[PDB]
Design a protein around this ligand. Sequence first.
Ligand code: HEM
Ligand code: HEM
Lengths: 726, 726
Amino acid sequence: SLAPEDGSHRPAAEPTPPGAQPTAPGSLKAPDTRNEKLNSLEDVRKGSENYALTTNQGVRIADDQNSLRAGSRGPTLLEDFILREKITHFDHERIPERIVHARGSAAHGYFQPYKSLSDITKADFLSDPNKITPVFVRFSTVQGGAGSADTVRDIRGFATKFYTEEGIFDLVGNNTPIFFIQDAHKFPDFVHAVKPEPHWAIPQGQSAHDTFWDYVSLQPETLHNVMWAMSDRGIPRSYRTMEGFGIHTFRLINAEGKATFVRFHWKPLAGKASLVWDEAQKLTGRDPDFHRRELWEAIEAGDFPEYELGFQLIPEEDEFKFDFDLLDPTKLIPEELVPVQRVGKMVLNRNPDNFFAENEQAAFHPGHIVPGLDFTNDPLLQGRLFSYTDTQISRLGGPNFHEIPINRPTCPYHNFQRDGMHRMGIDTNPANYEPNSINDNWPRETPPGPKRGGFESYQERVEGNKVRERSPSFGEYYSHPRLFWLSQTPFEQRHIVDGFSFILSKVVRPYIRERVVDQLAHIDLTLAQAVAKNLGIELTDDQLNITPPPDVNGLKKDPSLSLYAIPDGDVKGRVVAILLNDEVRSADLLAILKALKAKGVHAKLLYSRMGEVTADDGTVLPIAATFAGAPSLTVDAVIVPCGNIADIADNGDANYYLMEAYKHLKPIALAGDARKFKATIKIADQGEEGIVEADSADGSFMDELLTLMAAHRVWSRIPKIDKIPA
Amino acid sequence: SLAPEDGSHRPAAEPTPPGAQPTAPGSLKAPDTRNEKLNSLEDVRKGSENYALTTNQGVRIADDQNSLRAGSRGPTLLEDFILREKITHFDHERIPERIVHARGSAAHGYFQPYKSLSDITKADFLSDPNKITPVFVRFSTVQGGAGSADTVRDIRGFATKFYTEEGIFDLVGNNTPIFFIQDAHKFPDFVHAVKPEPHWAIPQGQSAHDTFWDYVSLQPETLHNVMWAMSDRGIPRSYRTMEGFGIHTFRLINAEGKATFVRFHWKPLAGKASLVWDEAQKLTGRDPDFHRRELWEAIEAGDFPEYELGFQLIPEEDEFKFDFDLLDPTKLIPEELVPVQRVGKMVLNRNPDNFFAENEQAAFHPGHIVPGLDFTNDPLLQGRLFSYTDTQISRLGGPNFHEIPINRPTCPYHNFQRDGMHRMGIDTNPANYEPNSINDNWPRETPPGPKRGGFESYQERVEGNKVRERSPSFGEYYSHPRLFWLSQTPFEQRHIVDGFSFILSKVVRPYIRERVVDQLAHIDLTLAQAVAKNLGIELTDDQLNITPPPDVNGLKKDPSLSLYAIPDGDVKGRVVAILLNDEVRSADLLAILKALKAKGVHAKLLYSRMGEVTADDGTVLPIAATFAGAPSLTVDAVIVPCGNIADIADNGDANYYLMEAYKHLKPIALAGDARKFKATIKIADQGEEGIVEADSADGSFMDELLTLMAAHRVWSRIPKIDKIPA
Ligand code: HEM
Ligand code: HEM
């Protein structure tokens, strides 16, 4: 017995805020959170408490501290099968990481539709609002390895496995509505150009290198998704506060056999929110696990990530009605033209028990569709269908990867496939082929039908010659980049310019920077000039005269493309740093902590050391972290209560905490003598918008702070931060 | 043609300083740098210029931009074998990363001894000062994955593969002279506890988490290497500026059969130097590839990493003459007791061509010894012998990993082994067994002897019962930690206290913190109390009265255990940031660059934008990076020349650059009106040691700066940095 006698080693099995308790496996933290998939995993969950330590063959071990040797200082013997089994298993623990999206974080949850969609699709999981479908979701970055940092600038992956009654459906999307390239044949070229360069394997998690921009400059189709990656969409505050998209047009097929084109969306119910670049890049150093951590702790707190599935629907007769090709994955469909129809809600409400077994071995593949859905001829989608099946054969060790417990359907599966590495299922069917008589032909084919039918493809007409040729309808590269740009707020446009400027500054070969700047001038001359100025580049008269590309079906902006143009802020689940001193005004702290609790906003109490401090009235305040240990990067706002300010006023760490929070546009509130910190951040006497200040933390101080938190960041401060040295 | 007209896409094939040219594959950057191993890889080097693009079967491709489809908007066809080959290969790119030391950076080079060692060993590679042995060396961290950052706090690996005329010898060592654990049976326990925790797979690259300190607190044998990890040894400046050690006692065997015990050492000819923690941690975010980059760029510049191989030698009759067991890998052999004898020099002088083919696939294993060496009963080394061969079977895909080109011997190898996956060698021998008559028994066994003999194990006497038992002589855990602690300078001690305080503050369960402080009180009460104070823990009276452990064979200190107590500074290869303005004084720049060139120190010219600025005499200066893009973290010292200082005086980024460099203890030099920057870092008019200042940047100014750089950092400034907000 090595556990403390007070039982403090074990976290409470009830929701608790971030940092209040050590994190735990989801079945120990939330044993009563259940769904059909989590219940079906019971057969493979292994406990531990009260069991003897054994080999994998069930033999009890007496001494797990020592190898068998001839004499206690002698050589180790070959006959030590206990040492060799333990070291052999350790020696073979790693499997290949995913070829892209190697870094990702996952959780269990469930999905329910708001109404039956049987008029447009026979998909069983969308047939009935009382039908609950378990889900497993994995969020990821794209370029870096499984040990790379979370808050890099990158596209994010948003992969959902729906365990439906008619089959697994994987919706394998990203957090932007288009991809970089048009045909799958290019995907190894593009991914090779953005990955670390092959001679020295640098840089990790970054597009800021020459090969990426070389490919971009030569492949203008990439420019649309580049614009999105360079914007603050490339640096989300959390997986909870980004959008998701299936990117491709797919089809829905109803029981009458009618096809409707569809594009899939996820809307974050917590709102859209991103970091700023310097903060994101700093955070890759101070907490490279920040999004992983935030996801897991939101779930343990009860702040479940929620997303609304929505569909943009286009009738078959309207395939050719747009200025762009529906099949072109580098083109978005503006919501002003085709609104997103709300379809259902997904809640992620339980973490995994074991990251390797459930997250790392999870396999998602966009070819996993169910009756009621079908594909289109999008030439990027068509090639993905080959790739995911193939990669999984090496990553997961063979063709029985669907037998790995996280990947198993919860519905029946029976067929004539046999053997392969790692085969779990023991088939008793006399027959392993069909047609057969010796088992009366079971398991049997099922005709298509309105419910529980076999899968049949939509009979789309194909006509043309066998060609390797890009459709001319795909040959337009600048109008969607321009629509995105014009849709952004002025501060979002500043961050895009700063994104391109910082990143192209890292391209070593200057002609590549000049080639990128030339492509920008085909998008928008204001963008191209602002980026050129930062790079010391002067546009030519020719460049200044390129005519802008056309509007997209008459649109000169679509506000749904901006993160911030339409307010959708939600504070629940956000976190505030409170900077303590050794004699805090206890009435400030009561008012601050209860107002944050009332809105589901978490707090972290910070000081110059660990332990406790004592408030004016004798209340013992437990310290969560130090100013250096939990820097401003990790919170959404900063509150300084009154008390003995001289305790911290000369603490370089406390001042720099506020300087960093201020630079990064975060709301700051200063009560009482904490206003002395105004000099640190150069705030005028009569104050400024985004700094909350009062004699005490009572009356309207917390409401004002919370209003700032709902707007996310103080964009109006952008021209004031250029001066502060932080 | 896509290349720019001027040929600027291609780096010059001559040595160039960091940033002057794009980096390149070693055989293209340095085609005249050769050794027997580099030449032998010629069979498998593949060029590219003037060749047609083909499938892997040699079929020329006409259109690599498109899949085959039925019509140009039609579905992709299964008969597209070009698309499927390209996507198959991409889908199967990844192999498992190494179970530990997955993040690493490698180069080729050569070794040669200073004099023959034939009196103590028959090893052929040590037999002749004029016989050069090629090497391949990989440096690494321990815990993080292949995509984690370089400048984490961790132990580092230093693995050298010597391609000798009598077989491959791999010296697989680390940068501290002990390990954390005593018996290989515990390695999976220790590794599991340090690695990301199994529920959520957090944290990457960091021992700052509960499981690791739980293990340490229950396994006091770990404390020695924990001390080294918590010191600035855990955060080296470069792989060129750290020590290497084989850790275990091995044997040398001479031609007369005499065994001598040996421990192996590498001494860095560039000197020992480490970062400070806040610098290291921020650099994981701003350049997570810093050590990989710095190594590759030093080699491209001609600043070849050089190390001296050194042996501590103990006669067989002196095995038991110390206070500690020589076979205990948690114990070091103080150089005050047993001096390191210099043996030879290793120079790393060429980078690889392809990081995956040569670095990722390299296999090092400490069981690869040659005649003239042998093992001892060290029970950590005994289990390593099993593990490396085993793990390479899955990581590298089968038992023919020695035919992967980097791993091949350059000396003859012939035997009766056959087959296995990806067998390259085609054996012509009629026999695949011995004894045989049908091939007159070839290849034949070779008796041992003085040179070119077969391997025979030294006939150590073994006497004991078959036991799983730790030698009693290993059960002492505090005297070597205490020796190490007392051997450190006062600032090194402060950084150890700060390393423990920062890390244990991140441990969530407070009783694990308390149990580690209790361990520290068994080492040194001053250390234990300074950590306790930062953690809000009060030592009990019993803890205050714990008797210090005994001195190590009478030693109260050994200065060879400190990074800095004995100067060994070398400025060649270091880098200075020069902060430009838009009217630089050219006479300042002349003098600065001429003095830096004389000592082989590199310069990076920084400004508030890219492109060029023009000096007072019209010299056009290309800008390397912006003040934000290349922060002070990435240089050794900062110079600000005179010129139009108003251009940069109120730039936040330039002021912050100086404040960060100051906080991180780096030399700063300010010429002429650049002295106006003294106010941002609060230097008095009379000036301060570590800040060089004058009316212009003459010979005297540069000599003082280069003097400061030779002592690496300005330790005397430590008391002044806590009040700077940076
Ligand atoms: C719209 C464009 C695409 C999107 C939205 C997309 C999305 C994703 C996501 C989210 C993952 C990670 C799934 C997980 O969390 O495990 C992924 C992995 C993968 N993607 Fe795609 N992807 C796209 C295009 C492609 C293309 C064109 C190919 C190849 C033809 C491809 C090949 C792969 C492979 C090989 C993996 C790793 C799968 C595994 O190991 O299980 N992706 N992609
Ligand atoms: C003195 C203590 C040890 C030192 C100095 C040491 C050093 C290293 C180094 C430097 C590497 C990376 C080599 C490379 O760059 O590829 C490595 C890899 C490894 N080490 Fe050790 N190690 C030690 C103890 C152990 C123990 C006790 C075991 C297991 C019994 C072990 C198992 C491994 C394994 C499995 C690898 C992966 C090798 C591969 O995949 O090729 N290590 N170690």
